Amino acid sequence: ANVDEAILKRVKGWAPYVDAKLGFRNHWYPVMFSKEINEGEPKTLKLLGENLLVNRIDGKLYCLKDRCLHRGVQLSVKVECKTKSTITCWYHAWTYRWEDGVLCDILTNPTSAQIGRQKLKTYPVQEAKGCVFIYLGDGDPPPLARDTPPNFLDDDMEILGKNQIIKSNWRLAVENGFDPSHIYIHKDSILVKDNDLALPLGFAPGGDRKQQTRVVDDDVVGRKGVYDLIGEHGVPVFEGTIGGEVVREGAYGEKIVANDISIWLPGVLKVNPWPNPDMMQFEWYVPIDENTHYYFQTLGKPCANDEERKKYEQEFESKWKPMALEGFNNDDIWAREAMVDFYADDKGWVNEILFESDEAIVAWRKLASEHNQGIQTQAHVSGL
Amino acid sequence: ANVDEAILKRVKGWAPYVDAKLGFRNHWYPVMFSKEINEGEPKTLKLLGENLLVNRIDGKLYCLKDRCLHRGVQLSVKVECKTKSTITCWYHAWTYRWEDGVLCDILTNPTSAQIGRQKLKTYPVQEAKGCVFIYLGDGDPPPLARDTPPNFLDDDMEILGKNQIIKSNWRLAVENGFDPSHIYIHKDSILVKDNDLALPLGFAPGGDRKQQTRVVDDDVVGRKGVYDLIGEHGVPVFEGTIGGEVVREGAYGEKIVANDISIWLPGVLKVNPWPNPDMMQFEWYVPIDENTHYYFQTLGKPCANDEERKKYEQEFESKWKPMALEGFNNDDIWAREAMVDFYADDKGWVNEILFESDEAIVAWRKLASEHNQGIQTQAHVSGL
Amino acid sequence: ANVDEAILKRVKGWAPYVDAKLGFRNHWYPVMFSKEINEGEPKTLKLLGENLLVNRIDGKLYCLKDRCLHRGVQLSVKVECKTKSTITCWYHAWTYRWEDGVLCDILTNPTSAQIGRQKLKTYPVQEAKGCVFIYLGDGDPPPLARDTPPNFLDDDMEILGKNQIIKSNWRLAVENGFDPSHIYIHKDSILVKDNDLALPLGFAPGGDRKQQTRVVDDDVVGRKGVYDLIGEHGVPVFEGTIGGEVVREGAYGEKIVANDISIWLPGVLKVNPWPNPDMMQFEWYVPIDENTHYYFQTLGKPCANDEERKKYEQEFESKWKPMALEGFNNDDIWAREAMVDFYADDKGWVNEILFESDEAIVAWRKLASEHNQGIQTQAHVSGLEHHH
Amino acid sequence: IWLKVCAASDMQPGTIRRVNRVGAAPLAVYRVGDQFYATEDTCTHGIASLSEGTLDGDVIECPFHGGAFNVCTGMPASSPCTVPLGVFEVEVKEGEVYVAGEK
Amino acid sequence: QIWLKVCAASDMQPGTIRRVNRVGAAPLAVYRVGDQFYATEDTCTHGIASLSEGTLDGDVIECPFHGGAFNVCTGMPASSPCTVPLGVFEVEVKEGEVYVAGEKKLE
C-alpha cells in the first residue's frame, strides 16, 4: 500500500484513509479557475501525484497526462502543438490527439506500427461556477454534483475564489478545517473584531457521541459527508480559565455565523453562513503529492442579476478576499504546516491523543474510509 | 538498533558505541549558557533528537518536551504562557504545568476527560558554572558530577566558554579531539606561535598499550573515562621525515601545555593544561541528531576572589576565545566534517585502518560501550 | 546487483545493462584534457563513484584514490605534496607514493608498524590525443584502442574538445546520442542553417534492419560496438506530417553529414561525418555517479601538416566549438535531464514504449550486456566485502 | 448499587458488551471463559469505545490505534496506551450479571 | 634465539590461542588447531588489534576489532576488510615442548 502494514493494521477504524496519502482516485477535483486557461495555451499541473496538461480548444477543455509514452519525458518541457487538435512531443515527435490521447502520428517515422496502437492517458475535465474540475479517475465519470457540497452548483450562486499551493498533506488541511476546537487559533482574528462576529474559544460537548455529528451517506446525487453538530447540545466556551482564573475570552460579537459546517468527499468543506450572514464558503484541499495540496477557496452568494453580481464582485476584491480568505484563513495555513512532522512518518496516526471535539474528525475518517472511490497509489503514478 | 546488524556483529569490541548514533540516554548534557535564558522567556533546542522547551520561572529552569500530546505540534510555534506556572498550546489550548508536565486545563473544553489524566514528558535541568545541563533520561537523575570531567566543578574554577552547532555526528567530534596525532592539523596554528607553545607534530607511543592509556571505572564520583598520558609516557615527534629527509618540524616553545588528556562520558574532553599551563579546557560534543552536535567548549582558570575575574574575563574575551577556542579549534571543525562521508553509511566503522596512536580512542570505544547509561533510538524520539 | 531483481527479471534481454547504473568497471575513460593538469598541480575528480586524484610528475601522470586509508578523509581537502614523489594526508600525516600508492611514511609516528605494509589504490592513466584516460579497473589494462571508436587514434587525426558535468545518468546520455530520431530536437539549431547542412527531422528505418544495424564484435583491436547505418540504409524524413499535412520540414542544405553513427563500449559515440563533411565527432558519456556524467566532446579532423593543424585550432575556437559543440549539442543537455524522472527508480526501463527507430539502441543494450568488462557496484566504492 | 447487565447466558465466551449508565460514562463488560470483568468503555488514549474493539484472552484491543488493556487489571498491554483503565465491581447472582461502582 | 620456547603442548587446549611477547620485537600468536600448532604475527594487518584476543574457528582466526579474518596456516586474508597477509612463523614440537621461529617465513 502507501503505508507500513504494521501501522495500517493498527488503525482498524480507518485504514483506507490513513493509506490515502496521495488522495482518493475516481473523484472530481478543482485545480484552477476558468479564466486562468485561455484558448490554445496549454497549462501544466500536478494532481494526485500525476503531471497533467490542460488545453482549451474551441472553448472546451481537454486533459492529457504530461508524460510521453516513448521515453517518459514531460511534453511540457517544450510545448509543441502543431495542429489545433494535437500536441507533438519535442523529443522524437510522437504526436497525440487532445480528444482521446491516441498516438496519431510520429513525424520522425511516419509509418511506425505504433501509430494508432498506443494511447496517452486522458482525464475528463468540466467547468462550473468559473472553476475547472478534473476527474482524476478511470472509466465514465459520475455527475460533478456528487463531489461538490450542497448548493455550490445552485443557479443563482455566484462563486468567486482564490487558489494556492500549501505545503502539507491534504488530510491535515481537511482535519484542521473540520476541527470544532481549532477556532481557538482564530481568537485574535481581525475579521471577527471588525465584522462583529460571535466566536467562542470552543465547546463543552453535550449529549451522546451520535448527536455530535450528522453523517450523510447519500443525497439523491450520491454525495457523502459529515455535519459538525457539537453546538446542538454543547455549551459554547467564551471564558478560558487556568486554575480557575480567567486568562482569555472569546468574541462577543452580535453576528452569529458558521452554524452549519460540513465536510464532503473527496475533501471539501462548507461553512454556512460565512464570513457574512448572506454568504457561504466552500474550500477544497486538493492532493498534489504526498506533501502538498491546492487550497482552493471559494465564497458563494446568491445573485439575482448582473447588478448584484457586480456589487458582490466588488466587496469580494475589496473586503472578503483580503479580510476573510486571506486574513482569517492564513492562520489555518500555518496550523496545517505545524502538524506535518508528527504525521510525516505516519506515526502520528497512531500516537495522537484525541479529545471530545475530535469526534467530528473521527466521523470524517470513517466516512472517507467507507465511501471513497479508490485509493491513489504510487503504482498509479509510476508503476511498472 | 540504529545500525545494520551485519555491522554491529563485526564490531564485537564496541557494538553499543557504533549503535549509539543518536548518543547515550540517561546522561547530563550542557545545551546553553545560563546567561542565554532570561526569566519567563522560553527557548527551544533539540537534544538527542528530541525537541525540547526550557523556561526560567522564579530563577529556576524547567524542561518540557516541545510536542503537544494532542496533534503533536511544537508548542514553540506560538508560545502562550498565560500563567507563570503553565504553557498553553496555541492549537486547541491544552495547558501543561512546567513543573510536572501535567495536563491541567484545556481552554477549548474545560470538561474534557483528558484533563489531569495525561502528562507531557519533562527532563531534569540544573545550572552550574554558568552552564545549563539537561538530564536527557528517565528516572531519578544522578549528580551532575558523574557526567563532568575532573576539576570542572571546583568551587574556585572559573568556567567560561562558547557554543555552536557543527555538522557532524558527535562521535567524530569525540574521536577528533581525543586523538594524539591529529594535532598535525594545528602545526601552523596561531595559538602555537603567539603563545610560545611547545607542540610536536604528534604524540607517539613509548611504553606499552596499557602504560599510556589509563581507563577509569573505579572513581567514587561515578565518572567513567580514559586518560592518554602523552606527556608522562608518550613520545613527541618534532621532526617529520619522508624517506629519511626532514620535510617538516614541530613547534619549539617554552610554554609546556597539554600533557594530560582524557575523554569522559557522555562525551566531554579534558585537555590539561590548556591553552595555558595554568588553565584547563573542557569541551562537550553534544548530540543534536545523527548528523549534528553542539560543540560546547569551555576554558577555565582557577580563582579565589571576586577579583582576577574581570581580568580573566577580559583575557578570556580578548585572546583566549578568539585564539584558543576559535583560532585554534576551528581547524578541528572542518576535520570532523571531512570524516562524515566515510562513516555516513556506518561502513567506516569496519573499513578504517587504525595505527598505534589510536590506542587511546579504542579504549574509549570499549569503555563508552560498557558504561553508557543507555542507547538513544528513534523509538525514544517518536514512538514504538 | 544495483537494481531490484523484480525489475531485472522484466528486462531479461539486457539485464546487465540496466543493472550498470554506476557504469562498467575495467575500461578506460577520458576525464579531462592534458592541458588541464600541470606539473605538480594535483587535480580531483570522481569516476564511477570513486574520488580520485591525478598528478603530473616529471611529465607523467599518476592516479591515486582520494581517500586516506586511515580515517577515510579526502586527501584533497588540503593537498600536501612535501616531496616530488609523495603526498601526505593533512590529518595525521600518513604519506603515500604516487607511483604505487604504498604508505611509505607517517610524519606523526615514524616507527609505526603500518609503514610499508599498506597501500592506497592506484589506477593506470595515459594521455592520447591531448586527452587524459584513466583505466578504472583492476589488474593490467588492455590497450587503450579497445575502448576508443575507430579512427580516433589515427596519426593525422587532430583532436580538440570540451568537457563538462551533466546531471543525468550516463546511459540516458548514451541513448540520447545514439538515437536517429532525436535530431528532431535540433531542427532549429544555428549549426543547421549557419553551416548549410542537409539534415532531416529524423532518420527512419529502411527496408531491412539486418543491413541498417551492424553489430561489431570481431574487431582486431577488440573494440565492441554497434553501427546504425542511417545514411546508406535509413530513410531521411524531411517532411513532417500530421494527418497527412506538412507542418514542418527538415534542412535542405548542401553539406552531407551523419552518414553513420556508432556507439562503442564503454560508452562513446562516433558521428561520421560531423559537423562538417571532413570531420568526425567522438563523444563519451562518462559515469561520475548514478546521477551524473562527464559529457566529454571531441571533434576530429585529419590534418596533414602544421599549417592545417593551426588553421584547425583557430576554426575550432571561432566556429566549431560555439556553433557545434555548444550550438548543436546544448539542447541534448536539457533533453537528457528531461528523462531523469522516468528512469529515477529504474522503472523506466520497464515502462518505456520503444519504436522501430530504437532498434539499434536495443542492439547496443544487448552488446553492452554481453561484452562489458564488469558491473561497478557501491561495494567497489565503499570497499569490497566477503565472509570466509 | 449494582445493575443487571444481562443474563450470563447472553454473553458467549470471548465476547464484549457495552453498558450505558444514565448521566454516567459508559462501561464495557467482557466475558473471558466463564468469568466476567468490567472497565470504562472509553479508551484512556483517546475517545474510542473499547466495546467495539477486539478481545483476545484477557486483553482488549482498541479499534482506533491498536492500543490494548488487560481487562482484569485494566493496565495497558500495548502502546500507545499508558494510562490505566478504571475497573469496576462485577458479580453474577443467580445467572444474572451485575456491575457496580469503581473499585 | 632462532627458536623461541613457547610452552608445553599440553598447556594449550585444541582451538585456543596464546600470545607470545618478545622484547624488542612484535608479539606473535600461536594457535593450536586440533593437535597441530601454527604461528603468525599477533597484530591484525588491518589495524592494531591482537588476534590472540579473537575467535578461532577451525584454522581461521577472526579479528575482534572489525571481523576481518585470516587462515592461520597460510596467513592469507579469509574475510574482509583484511587484505594484507600475516607474517607466518614456523613452529616445532620437541620433547612435548612448543617452539616458534624468531624470524617469520620468507615468501
Ligand SMILES: c1ccc2c(c1)[nH]c1ccccc12
Ligand atoms: C467557525 C467560524 C468559521 C470557520 C469555522 C468555525 N471553521 C472554518 C473552517 C474554514 C473556514 C472558516 C471556518
Ligand SMILES: c1ccc2c(c1)[nH]c1ccccc12
Ligand atoms: C592533543 C593536544 C591538544 C589537544 C588535543 C590533543 N585535543 C584537543 C582538543 C581541544 C584543544 C586542544 C586539544
Ligand SMILES: c1ccc2c(c1)[nH]c1ccccc12
Ligand atoms: C543522428 C545524426 C547526428 C547526430 C546524432 C544522430 N547524434 C549525435 C550526437 C552528437 C552530434 C551529432 C549527432
Ligand code: FES
Ligand atoms: S520521449 Fe516523446 S517522442 Fe520520444
Ligand code: FES
Ligand atoms: S495540538 Fe496542542 S492542543 Fe491540539
Ligand code: FES
Ligand atoms: S585520515 Fe589521513 S592520516 Fe589520518
Ligand code: FES
Ligand atoms: S484511542 Fe485507544 S489506542 Fe488510541
Ligand code: FES
Ligand atoms: S583490526 Fe583487524 S579487521 Fe580491522
Ligand SMILES: [Fe+2]
Ligand atoms: Fe480555521
Ligand SMILES: [Fe+2]
Ligand atoms: Fe584538535
Ligand SMILES: [Fe+2]
Ligand atoms: Fe542530440
